[PDB]
Amino acid sequence: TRLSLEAMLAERAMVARQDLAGLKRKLAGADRVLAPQSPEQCGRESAQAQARSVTSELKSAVKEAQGLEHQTLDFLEQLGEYPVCGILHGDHPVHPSGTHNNNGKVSVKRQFAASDALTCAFRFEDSDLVRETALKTTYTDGTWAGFVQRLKMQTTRKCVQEKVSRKLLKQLFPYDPQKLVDVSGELSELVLGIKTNAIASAGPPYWRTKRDALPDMLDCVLPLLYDHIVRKDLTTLRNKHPELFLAECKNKTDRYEVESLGEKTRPYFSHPFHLSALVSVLSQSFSGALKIMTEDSTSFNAYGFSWTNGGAEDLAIWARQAGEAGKKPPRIACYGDDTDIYYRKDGKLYRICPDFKQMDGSVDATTIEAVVDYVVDAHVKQYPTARQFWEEVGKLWVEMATQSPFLIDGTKVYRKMQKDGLMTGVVGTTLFDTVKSALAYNDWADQLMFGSLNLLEEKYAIEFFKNKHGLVIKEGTWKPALVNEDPGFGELWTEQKFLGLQLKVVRRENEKVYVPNLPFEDWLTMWVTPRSTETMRERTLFDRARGLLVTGAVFDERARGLMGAVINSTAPEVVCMRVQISDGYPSYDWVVSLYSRDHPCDMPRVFPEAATLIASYRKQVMDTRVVI
Amino acid sequence: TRLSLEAMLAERAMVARQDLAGLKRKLAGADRVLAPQSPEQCGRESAQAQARSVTSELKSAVKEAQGLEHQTLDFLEQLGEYPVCGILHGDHPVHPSGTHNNNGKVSVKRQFAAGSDALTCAFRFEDSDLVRETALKTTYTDGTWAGFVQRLKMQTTRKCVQEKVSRKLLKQLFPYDPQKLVDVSGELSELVLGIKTNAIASAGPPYWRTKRDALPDMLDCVLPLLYDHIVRKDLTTLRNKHPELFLAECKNKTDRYEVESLGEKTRPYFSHPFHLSALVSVLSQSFSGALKIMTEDSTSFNAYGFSWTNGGAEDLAIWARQAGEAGKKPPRIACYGDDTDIYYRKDGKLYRICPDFKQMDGSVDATTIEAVVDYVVDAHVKQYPTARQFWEEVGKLWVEMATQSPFLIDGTKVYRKMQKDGLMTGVVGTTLFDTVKSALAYNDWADQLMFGSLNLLEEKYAIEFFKNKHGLVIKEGTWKPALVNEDPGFGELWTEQKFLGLQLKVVRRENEKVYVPNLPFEDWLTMWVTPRSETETMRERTLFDRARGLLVTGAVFDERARGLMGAVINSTAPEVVCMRVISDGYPSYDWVVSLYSRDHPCDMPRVFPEAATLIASYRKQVMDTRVVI
RNA sequence: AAAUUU
RNA sequence: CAAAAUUU
RNA sequence: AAAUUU
RNA sequence: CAAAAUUU
Ligand SMILES: O=c1ccn([C@@H]2O[C@H](COP(=O)(O)NP(=O)(O)OP(=O)(O)O)[C@@H](O)[C@H]2O)c(=O)[nH]1
Ligand SMILES: O=c1ccn([C@@H]2O[C@H](COP(=O)(O)NP(=O)(O)OP(=O)(O)O)[C@@H](O)[C@H]2O)c(=O)[nH]1
Ligand SMILES: [Mn+2]
């Protein structure tokens, strides 16, 4: 009741942005700063019909592939059935009563189920292109057949142990010791500091979101785990409550090639919240301290690299200092299985952008153990009072990464027969892949110095990584290319992709700004396969179009036109409504600014008078000093 | 959707306090710090039945009194009918279609309706005969036509006396800090945006909706129009073209009324246009913020701003004691509207009078009103001279609203007060105007004591004096001088009289004396059973809040009232105590004593000390990572 | 809430 | 969405 | 949101 | 709740 008028106006503002009908009415006359758009190609009805037709074909293709028989799970170790956890937190079990329980045994059921975006594509683009694009890739749960095949490939690959030491990791993966979290502090506070996905599964035995399981984890399971860690008593705990150390093997819903649905569906592992949270203390602290290649010339690390705020140009600057192959250091930087390589032949700069196939399967136990050691050691050198505890956590970490028992479908509990091979989904997954990859390329570079310059060639490179590192180069990814070291306006560094994107130079006045880029076809693939009321659907179209523009679609003339069309199609009320109000849009100029070294600024408003129109008030200066 | 666990816990905490069902489950049986309470007298069904029975009698009494004929409104000037305002703000009229409009004329309909959980609680925990007689004596009601018109006439037609007043005299009685005054030479929009108001109060004509709903129409449309016409000396053009912009509504106040006197007494007030009140509030609120009170400055007669808390109750006593021998040295006099505390000595002994004026607004003369407006405007322009002319124009509007505004009552007929004298209660500054008139009269009273007229201490001559010399009527039985207990014993009263509706009492804390407000049980009980007013939960929560409020105001210092409020508090379900709406605390005796003392502020004690952790299902446990393994 | 990436 | 990096 | 006061 | 003062 008793409120200042200023405050009252603010309250009215918030409330107003929730009333769609009122927004629609107040914005109805407003000047709209339209995005650049390409013209319509056909009407709603035709576009919907074409979308329906494509969706219908995809649905049958997916349903057929999902119907395929899957091969036996004999390649895994069998450990029988596990009893459901009996642990109570107050008046309820930590494992909910009616869930994931077949006659007292833990059970799971894999889901393999069978577009607004697609309609937009047909509305604004050539039918044949949209149709062939939409029929090649689909966002899907995948297939049993594909799931099991990839699982086998991930769990039974012949690996090679890397030759690694702390000295070598210090060189390739330098970090700032002062940025490491003081893990000598009290454990509860440290755990409370970790970030996570609130709606991700908390794993066994919570069988609900991390948000829902949080109290059960912190108040009940974590102290129990701590007590048993510090008393060297984990085996008692494991035997009495096996579900506390159980993972779930899941099929990843993803953008999969329709052609290969029955051969390829990615598995990952969801671990218990209490274990992942504990390991995250070390892992997230270490991530925060890690340098990237653009900050330290010895680092092979791109885990942490950003294209924005000069990053794209930093990559180029870093790359150019690469030396003559066999004489001076190349420039190599790794992010998981994805690597950018620069070297000179007769002073000319070359680039390779190779990838590894099902890489996690090739990550050897030595590399995993060395990475855990390096992270643990980094912390205990800086905070020595807590050495023993964190070494124990180190052991759990390694176990989760290599040997965790797991469910797939039903009650049968499996384990990977060999220790080698990374259990994708463990905390630190990406770091493990990055390190394995970097050790291999570090060895590769050493061999160049010893004179073996034929390792620059596809044939010998593929042989080398297979034989010497147990790593499989993805077909067609070893294609050295002459780099455009100083690109012209609108020209590319090379046609190759690193971290899914090409590097290009665009003009601003007479300056060159380095920005990400892809051909239209790639942007279109992303557009028509979203990674998923009428109002929320309309708003999602708006948001996805903005996102793609920002990522680099704005620098492709056809993609920019498509995204702009979608943006301009979004009703004013949907643009301006309160959301989890973002009523700006990525203009070309703003996106260029984002990738440049400019100070951060807000996206331009779609409706510049929205604030005042929504409030039904535009301030007018009234001077109290006037002569009367 | 990626957050820290700490943040996730915080989100869960906020959500949890809104999930009543979950709160109910988690706090069921929780360790509860019970308030002191008197025992149950009867159960709910019996108490509800008794409440129903009392409510039924009150309803008939009110309905009968509302049926009484009212006297004609011929004592006011008639101005005919006003056309509804045609001003548009964008796609809508400022005066909404189909409201307050009788065939194109502004119209209004007075509401006198004949419409308790509180009463049920009273019966649950107190003697039936006492609750019943208490509840039948006072009711919260719209009042009556008969009573409304009688008080309206008394307010608009009283023979007033012009005060002898000047800036010099007001500086003396109403000192202020000039440095606290708002810089009113700033830009107008910013100044207006800075005023506080009641969001759900009527915005008046021509908006005919809440201030919250009318705010854009006011700021964006009407206020600039008003400003343009002010600065061009063109207000009469505006008045003629859009009369509704300068129209008030005369309304009946819903209030606690004696059932006996329903047909004789219902308070009238005036609701003015938002644009005019907002403008004047810039000056008035600024001035209120600068005003000193009697406990800060020995010359001040002003209690507008006084607080009983944080030593205030003791400050009153300290201030009072320095009163001198009547006819030799200054008394101690302090005014808040029509309510005044007076201290003097006869043969060195301290006496107290707590007189009140009857329908005081009717007695406030136009000279006093004009002087107060001048004093406030001048205070600002002395500090910020660049804006003199504008604020003098606002000064003129201010006077017009407080003495001569045209107004509706019921139907389309527009009235005006025939005489300029008499305050139109509801204008911005209402309380200050009353306070000043009252203080001028008492200042004169005190002067006459010095000139030798010591019989003005006596009821007979005091009443005569205020009537004849100031046009003010002392309410009967409010002039009763009393020997003050200057150093009160533990549990003793300063005197039995009320100032600002409360007695002053001394309570013991260890071996210290703390000065606190107090009333007899019957008064607290009257307040309890007549709330100044939806789920069962919100009703239960309101009971909890009213019980706490009364305790804090001083009910905690009466044994039976403390017991009643405590019983209500202890009856409140845990979920209702702990839900999102300080909130989950209760006023213990010790905490309330601390509030009235000069102690630093602290939170009320928790009803459920471990509520936070129980609700979260998490108690932090220290786990040491430095352990040897 | 959204986009890209691994 | 299992862990994650980069964006607004 | 709530109590008292004018 | 017409303007308000004090308080939680
Ligand atoms: O969502 C993801 C995608 C990829 N990765 C990591 O990326 C690495 C390789 O990805 P992958 O092992 O999942 N299969 P992939 O190599 O993509 O097969 P292909 O279709 O031939 O390219 C693995 O080591 C994963 O751990 C993730 O951790 N999460
Ligand atoms: O709710 C209120 C009460 C009082 N007042 C103002 O304060 C003045 C005195 O306040 P008052 O409330 O004590 N009563 P008064 O009308 O003088 O006589 P009576 O009814 O017999 O006790 C009134 O005359 C009004 O101007 C208000 O503005 N609002
Ligand atoms: Mn990959």
Residue numbers in the entry:
A (entry chain A): 11 to 124, 129 to 546, 553 to 600, 624 to 671
B (entry chain B): 11 to 125, 129 to 546, 552 to 599, 624 to 671
Paper text:
Thosea asigna virus (TaV) is a (+) ssRNA virus that infects the larvae of a defoliating moth (Setothosea asigna) and the prototypic member of the Permutotetraviridae family. In a previous work we have structurally and functionally characterized the non-canonical RdRP domain of TaV (TaVpol: residues 1-674 of the ORF1 product), showing close resemblances with flaviviral RdRPs. In these enzymes, motif C is located upstream of motif A forming a noncanonical C–A–B–D arrangement with a unique connectivity of the major structural elements of the active site. Here we report the X-ray structures of TaVpol captured in three replication-elongation states, revealing high resolution mechanistic details of different events in the nucleotide addition cycle for a non-canonical RdRP.
In addition, a stalled Δ10TaVpolΔ607-624-RNA-rNTP ternary complex was obtained in the presence of the nucleotide analog uridine-5’-[(α,β)-imido]triphosphate to catch the TaV enzyme in a distinct catalytically relevant conformation. The addition of a non-hydrolysable UTP was used to trap the incoming nucleotide in the active site, before its incorporation. The UTP analog was placed in the active site in an equivalent position to that observed in previous structures of RdRP catalytic complexes. In this position, the pyrimidine ring formed a Watson–Crick base pairing with the templating nucleotide A+1. An extensive network of interactions involving the ribose hydroxyl groups 2′ and 3′ were observed, stabilizing the position of the UTP analog in the active site. The side chain of D374 (motif A) was repositioned to contact both the 3′OH group of the ribose moiety and the T438 side chain (motif B). The ribose 2′OH was also recognized by T438 and D447 of motif B. Despite the addition of the Mg2+/Mn2+ mixture to the crystals by soaking, only one peak of extra density was identified in the structure to position one ion. This metal ion was located close to the side chain of D351 (motif C) but far away of the triphosphate moiety of the rNTP analog that was salt bridged with the basic side chains K488 (motif D) and R280 of motif F in the rNTP tunnel. Only one metal ion was observed in the catalytic site of this structures (Mn2+ A), leaving the metal B position empty.
